[PDB]
Design a protein around this nucleic acid. Structure first.
Length: 859
DNA sequence: GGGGACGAT
């Protein structure tokens, strides 16, 4: 057991800390307390009874409006722009089943609609179910909710379904997203929303009494929210006989949802797309005639799969080609000069259209971009100036432009080098050729060793099936699969359903507001039950941050954390920021970890965006504090009317920056309504009196990211110029390093040796994707595992019983006493939410902490 | 010295 630096405090400081704590100790309307004990007092049976009478607006309908809408419905049926927008509607496959669906919804609680892309189930089925109730004279009783996996989906489908009715947005069709809503009318309505929005509207309406039909769509992607909702529907529907809900899916393992609902009726409806011809590796090399020129069991493990297949079709391709499939180099994207030649192939033959190339990640997207842009080969020189190459990646701006979606200049063909982002999220219309390497990346979490890893793996058959349809949106296309058909048969059906890949601490908490107290029993109900060990780890963390007691029941703090749209750890961090008057920078850090970072990473300027993140970090050695600095600079550029030049100079997305600002202001209102803030402005002066005390911020950042700590021990000089080598290990002993995109990557001369992080990930090394340098005094205050004693013959104070620091008994005795009242303050404030009076008893304890943390300020 | 798309009244 080794000892760290000294964390003792001067006499005059402790004398004042003891003064403030003694001052805080002699102190003597909670509607929330009545709320918190009432949820625990009820069991499920009275829980269901109380919410039915609380949410009963749909028990009333208005006939004066029923008949009014019924008479106006087809007054439009007689005009010739309606009655001209409906024959085009009845050229969509779903309208042919319209009457059968009206029947199937009437006699079944749940139905399933399975349909390929282009059928228009999303666009039509809500209209069909709405127009039926209207013409029957039941319009005011019909309220339709239709979930979508992504935001961009929920809007564009709401905009076009609206124009199909000759109405502007918000009359009969509306959308409701996080931070954004153009909501439709109250009744006789269609509302497209994100799955997440419905899940939070559940805590006030847990058994869906404010809707008449629910439409879950793209459940085939098996996102966490869709499988959660279907598990939650099995609890709700026994108590809601009149609730209709129909599931929507593509043609990937559709029977799973039919089985999950006891063989509910399933509608398989037509597809409307152009035929896409599908080649494979044996078919591509048969036309291209490329060959590869420039490990101990791979050669025979591919031998074990392919030549059982090579000798199958022995007389179906030339044997010069079948030797080309014994190579482990032939399938995937190992030889990118092969994909390069395949692109040059498509340019000569195979007439007009765009090429979309699916490569696993940023690394191999760059290699062909450079091969295509500055080619070393003769035939590459010929095609260079007649290709318009757009690389597509979530960390690149091309996806937020108009160019990649527009058709290329005359005499040039557009080539898109993308990740899987172009599979469902981003869609390009003029694509007619797809080169699917079959290789992508994914994160797997090892539950046994607690390491997240990003690994290059093979694509599913579901992803390959989805990428085929990308080329068939405008004309007959071709999809080039760079892997043998034998490889396809070892490929899994669908990607690992992500409920088996997530940390569940947020979902365990969310379920407590819905009176689902046993997460082992409930999560076993889902289509694919999560590992019970991953459930225990969620419970154990929630117990550590004390959102639950040791019995498992949820605490008054846990209820607030369950009510904030953010993971419970930083939800607690946002909460601490209100107590400590640094709302603006901490909410920027929490909003930036919950969603994306604003910085683009355009190809070739890797070095330039390293220098610019360091400039906006302002030497504060924090990837989280630097994003707030970026928001401060982004705000100032709007006051300066220099927004565009600022975002260009500095490689930021104006789109995500504004989304970060909207979520921060969302955190402000929610705490203000929870009686934690006197004002709903994240920039208000009272909530920000400490917003530039930098040791104050790392303490609150550490309070949220604890216990993800790491200690640095070494630093290099010889013999470069800037970047240093770090021997640094997390608290578990595992040696790690700053991720190169992190601000602290390769830096030297840190004021402190200890760091906190949000995410550690293994790709090339154990990397910390983000880090803020913290001080031992801050960790000891807010962390746990704090004991005082002697070891060599040396007085110490430890944190997590991992990091032991020298300090005398005089300071250790009071910070232990300071931790005890900080804990009894937080519990009272969660039970009786009120903002801290600036000249009150509680502020004295706050100032006692500001004083101890101020001792680590820059000299 | 390197970043597989989603998302929360």
């Amino acid at each position: 057991i080794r000892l760290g630096c000294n964390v003792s405090a001067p006499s005059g400081v402790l004398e004042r800390v003891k003064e403030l704590m003694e001052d805080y100790s002699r102190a003597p309307d909670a509607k929330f307390q009545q709320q918190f004990r009432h949820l625990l007092s009820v069991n499920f049976e009275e829980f269901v009874a109380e919410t039915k009478e609380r949410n009963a607006d749909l028990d009333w309908v208005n006939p004066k409006l029923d008949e009014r809408l019924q008479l106006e419905l087809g007054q439009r049926q007689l005009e010739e722009n309606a009655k001209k927008r409906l024959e085009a509607r009845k050229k969509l496959p779903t309208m042919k089943y319209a009457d059968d669906i009206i029947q199937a919804v009437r006699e079944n609680q749940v139905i399933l609609i399975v349909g390929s892309t282009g059928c228009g189930k999303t666009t039509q089925v809500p209209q069909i179910l709405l127009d039926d109730a209207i013409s029957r004279g039941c319009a005011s009783s019909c309220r339709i909710i239709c979930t979508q996996p992504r935001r961009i989906s929920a809007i564009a489908i709401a905009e076009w379904v609206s124009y199909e009715r000759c109405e502007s947005l918000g009359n009969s069709v509306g959308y409701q997203i996080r931070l954004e809503s153009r909501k439709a009318r109250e009744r006789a309505s269609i509302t497209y929303c994100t799955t997440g929005v419905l899940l939070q509207q559940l805590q006030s309406d847990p058994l869906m009494h404010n809707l008449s039909v629910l439409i879950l769509d793209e459940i085939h992607e098996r996102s966490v929210e869709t499988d959660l909702l279907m598990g939650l529907l099995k609890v709700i529907l026994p108590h809601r006989p009149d609730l209709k809900v129909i599931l929507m899916s593509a043609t990937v393992r559709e029977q799973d949802f039919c089985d999950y609902f006891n063989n509910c009726p399933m509608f398989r409806i037509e597809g409307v797309m152009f035929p896409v011809k599908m080649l494979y590796l044996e078919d591509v090399l048969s036309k291209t005639n490329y060959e590869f020129q420039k490990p101990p069991e791979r050669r025979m493990k591919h031998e074990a799969m392919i030549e059982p297949y090579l000798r199958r079709i022995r007389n179906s391709y030339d044997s010069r080609v079948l030797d080309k499939l014994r190579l482990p180099e032939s399938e995937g994207c190992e030889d990118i000069d092969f994909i390069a030649d395949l692109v040059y192939y498509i340019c000569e033959n195979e007439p007009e259209g765009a090429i979309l190339v699916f490569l696993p990640g940023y690394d191999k997207i760059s290699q062909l971009y450079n091969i295509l842009d500055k080619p070393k080969t003769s035939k590459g020189q010929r095609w260079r100036d007649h290709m318009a190459v757009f690389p597509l990646h979530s960390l690149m701006q091309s996806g937020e432009q108009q160019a990649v979606f527009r058709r290329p200049p005359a005499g040039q063909r557009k080539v898109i080098i993308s990740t899987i982002i172009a599979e469902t999220s981003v869609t390009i219309d003029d694509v007619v050729y797809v080169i699917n390497s079959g290789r992508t990346k994914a994160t797997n979490y090892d539950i046994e060793t607690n390491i997240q890893s990003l690994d290059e793996v093979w694509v599913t058959k579901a992803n390959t099936q989805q990428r085929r349809g990308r080329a068939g949106r405008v004309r007959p296309g071709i999809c080039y699969n760079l892997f043998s058909r034998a490889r396809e048969d070892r490929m899994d059906d669908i990607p690992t359903p992500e409920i088996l890949r997530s940390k569940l601490e947020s979902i365990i908490l969310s379920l407590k507001l819905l009176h689902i107290d046993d997460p082992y029993r409930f999560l076993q109900t889902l289509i694919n039950a999560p590992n019970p060990e991953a459930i225990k780890m969620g419970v154990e963390l929630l117990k550590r941050i004390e959102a639950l007691d040791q019995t498992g029941t949820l605490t008054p703090l846990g209820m607030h954390l369950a009510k904030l749209p953010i993971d419970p750890q930083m939800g607690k961090m946002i909460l601490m920021s209100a107590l400590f008057c640094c709302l603006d920078p901490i909410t920027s850090a929490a909003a930036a970890l919950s969603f994306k970072s604003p910085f683009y990473s355009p190809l070739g300027k890797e070095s330039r965006v390293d220098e610019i993140k360091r400039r906006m970090a302002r030497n504060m050695r924090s990837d989280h504090l630097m994003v707030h600095n970026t928001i401060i600079a982004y705000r100032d550029s709007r006051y300066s009317h220099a927004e565009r030049d600022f975002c260009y100079k500095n490689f930021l997305s104006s789109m995500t920056l504004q989304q970060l600002e909207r979520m921060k202001n969302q955190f402000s209102e929610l705490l203000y309504n929870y009686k934690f803030l006197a004002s709903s402005n994240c920039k208000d002066a009272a909530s920000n009196k400490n917003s530039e005390k930098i040791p104050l911020l790392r303490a609150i950042i550490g309070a949220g990211l604890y216990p993800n700590m790491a200690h640095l021990r070494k630093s290099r000089q010889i013999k470069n110029r800037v970047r240093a080598i770090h021997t640094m290990a997390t608290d578990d002993g595992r040696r790690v390093n700053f991720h190169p995109s992190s601000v602290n990557s390769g830096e030297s001369g840190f004021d402190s040796a200890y760091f906190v992080y949000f995410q550690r990930q293994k790709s090339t090394d154990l990397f910390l994707l983000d880090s803020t340098m913290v001080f031992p005094m801050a960790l000891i205050i807010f962390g746990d595992g704090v004991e005082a004693g002697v070891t060599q013959n040396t007085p110490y104070l430890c944190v997590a019983k991992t990091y032991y620091f020298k300090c005398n008994r005089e300071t250790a005795d009071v910070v232990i006493q300071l931790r005890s009242n900080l804990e009894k303050l937080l519990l009272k404030k969660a039970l009786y939410p009120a903002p801290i009076e600036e000249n009150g008893y509680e502020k004295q304890l706050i100032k006692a902490i500001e004083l101890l943390l101020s001792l680590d300020e820059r000299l």
